[PDB]
Amino acid sequence: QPITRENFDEWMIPVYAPAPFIPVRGEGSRLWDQQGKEYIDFAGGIAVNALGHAHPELREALNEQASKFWHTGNGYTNEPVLRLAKKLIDATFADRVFFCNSGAEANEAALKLARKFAHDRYGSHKSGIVAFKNAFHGRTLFTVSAGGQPAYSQDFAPLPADIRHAAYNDINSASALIDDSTCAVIVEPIQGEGGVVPASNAFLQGLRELCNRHNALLIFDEVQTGVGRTGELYAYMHYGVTPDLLTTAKALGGGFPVGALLATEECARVMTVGTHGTTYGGNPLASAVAGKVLELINTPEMLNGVKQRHDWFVERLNTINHRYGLFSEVRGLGLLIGCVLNADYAGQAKQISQEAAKAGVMVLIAGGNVVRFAPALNVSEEEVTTGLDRFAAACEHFVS
Amino acid sequence: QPITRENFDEWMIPVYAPAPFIPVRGEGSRLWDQQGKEYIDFAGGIAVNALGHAHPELREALNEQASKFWHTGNGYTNEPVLRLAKKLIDATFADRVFFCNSGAEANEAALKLARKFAHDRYGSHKSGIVAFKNAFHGRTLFTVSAGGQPAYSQDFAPLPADIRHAAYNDINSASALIDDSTCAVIVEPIQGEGGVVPASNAFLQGLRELCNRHNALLIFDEVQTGVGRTGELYAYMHYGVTPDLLTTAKALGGGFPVGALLATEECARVMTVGTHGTTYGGNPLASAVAGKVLELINTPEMLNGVKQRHDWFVERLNTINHRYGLFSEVRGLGLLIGCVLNADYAGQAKQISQEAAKAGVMVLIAGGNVVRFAPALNVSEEEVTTGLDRFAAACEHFVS
Ligand SMILES: Cc1ncc(COP(=O)(O)O)c(C=O)c1O
Ligand SMILES: Cc1ncc(COP(=O)(O)O)c(C=O)c1O
Ligand SMILES: [Mg+2]
Ligand code: NA
């Protein structure tokens, strides 16, 4: 039979309430549903589709590797995964890489590593993880425990112990929870799902200093801010603060499920044979696509084109706002942007987002108070503009 | 750029010591390395590539969805994921499914669901998970804590609490750890990684009765035993015991990263909006490939073919064994097969598997005492007979 939106409510464990309409194909930043209706996509796969939909180069790298082999599992290395490791190593502070299949898997590896590193060098008691309220790090028991949203963790207790949460951008708060017993501090350089809130340069530099004083590993969760999103390859290059461990996923594979953990030689050393692993991680199909993604994103032209796009979005969202008075602030960095709703409209992000979709434009929320834009890094000027026209018309209807 | 095996030792976090040769392509059950050497592949992707390397239909289904769209994140459903969900529902005891990226993510979803379920119907004190010594269920902190190889978890303490391990196949062992505080019992229908140990029928009925008496969810981890592996679509069907949750990954995707949680209506009801999720899970690329795998594997010809192929392997392993006296036993079901080394060859499975690679056959281990075979369910009669000739050669060298 045909497939209907009402099938989703009989067949899926109900953790999501997705859009009333169902996408069937797309190209760059346009996407179309089963009845031909056209959307401009500023969701961008939740900051994943860095190169837009059905990119011809990503396709050709896909079918080219797909016609050789897809997977053997990690008893055997492959050429694409090694080339992909080299690109990441050459391009970042990393000296070594582990590949996995999601952002949570990447953060599981990172927290595992910092645990074993501290145990091995200082002893079993040094196990403290400090993370930040409002953080999101994934949905595995360990990563959702690391996450700063107790409503996502509470139901699944007992939670792994020795995790504590400081207030984001609050140096003294973090300082109070970081002592010689801390093995890791995990922080997103911009909080993503928690509202598109960027770190300040002094906050990060202060976490770097605290980690050094207390021999703790600093982990940047760059799952959302990485691979071009901010206008440098990783947000840490923008802030100018270097972590011991950096995690990466989402846009890494331009839509193919991939993630990775980047590490210094010193940290890498501690993960000996059999101490972590993954069936699919490092397959050559993912690795061929991620390799092409990095080839295309990590160029001066694409990245400066991200800085430029930030200004086309912020200028236009600013003039929409003057006209309609929805938001108190447009914030973020590169093409991760949040519109903060005002006192009159607070908690209403999702209704604006639903209006947007009726008007032909896909936008995200980030908590009930922020409308979040995470479009393709190659969205064209014409796409930004027509998308923002439809968002204008939706703010129109919404504001009454 | 030049790529060599010594690059693996410099670029990769060193959790794997993989083969000294590097695959570059395959077709059916043959694989070829960078120098053109040819291997018969009885490792099967570690029971993932259920239809062999580079399958033309799996590439046609891949290229087809790749050219419409790959990903949106789960704010938007898609036709291939729904169709995949409905195949799974139509073919098993399930009413709903959840999609993720890996068998560990599948098992996280099932262990989370069992905990919330307990908590919501009886109170937050009912949190206990019973697993089995030598089980493998993944590398996330929660799932490696549920698996029964403490060597894989101890470095990463403190572990999530309330987990206990009973002895596999020992119903009194299980009985002593399962009580009214238990939310779940999770078990592999054949322990895979732990030696290719099949469950007995009485053992699995015993856990179903115990879970019934104590109101605990029974979870079959069919990540390895799933999707045709045993000669039935899923092992639980061979055994006539029905779980409350089943997890599936590996061969589900024929090589593409995908996994699923299969649930009855009453368990699915428990995971309400926002209580869980995943960026990549359920994308249409994965669902389009898995959809195709299910279609090609779930037929009476493939599945009976897996019964026939079991006999090819065992008839011939027996005659190798008659010549070299290596194995006390040949065990398993359909195409998961463990050859158990004799006391005179105890702990030498990996050495055997190295010799087999030298002779052009890829095989696995399952602990140091079992040689494991997990080939493609569509492996040909010629490929079986050529691979065993080489495995026989490799046995002869090994015995001197
Ligand atoms: C910053 C950050 N880290 C980790 C994750 C978990 O990623 P995944 O959904 O790929 O498992 C997400 C997803 O929202 C995220 O935004
Ligand atoms: C029975 C079983 N469950 C779960 C897993 C974890 O699967 P993955 O490596 O896909 O995360 C494995 C992998 O070895 C397995 O054999
Ligand atoms: Mg609730
Ligand atoms: Na069913």
Short description:
The structure is a homodimer of 400-residue chains. Chain A has 400 residues and is an alpha/beta fold.
Helix proportion of residues of chain A, in percent? 40-55%
Rounded to the nearest angstrom, the distance between the terminal CA atoms of chain A is: 41 Å
Tally of individual domains of chain A:
2
The CATH topology of the largest domain in chain A corresponds to: Aspartate Aminotransferase, domain 2
Largest interface: chains, residues each? A-B, 114 and 113 residues
Taken as a percent bin, the fraction of beta residues of chain A is 15-25%
Briefly note the structural class of the backbone of chain A. Answer: alpha/beta
Each distinct ligand: pyridoxal-5'-phosphate, magnesium ion, sodium ion
The number of helical elements of chain A comes to 15
Rg of chain A, Å, rounded: 21 Å
Tell me the name of the CATH homologous superfamily of the largest domain in chain A: Type I PLP-dependent aspartate aminotransferase-like (Major domain)
Main sheet makeup of chain A: 7 strands, mixed
Number of strands of chain A: 17
What is the approximate shape of chain A? Answer: globular
CATH arch. level architecture of the largest domain in chain A: 3-Layer(aba) Sandwich
Oligomeric state of shown chains: homodimer
CATH class assignment of the largest domain in chain A:
Alpha Beta
Catalytic activity (chains A, B): N(2)-succinyl-L-ornithine + 2-oxoglutarate = N-succinyl-L-glutamate 5-semialdehyde + L-glutamate
Organism (chains A, B): Escherichia coli (strain K12)
Cofactor (chains A, B): pyridoxal 5'-phosphate
Pathway (chains A, B): Amino-acid degradation; L-arginine degradation via AST pathway; L-glutamate and succinate from L-arginine: step 3/5
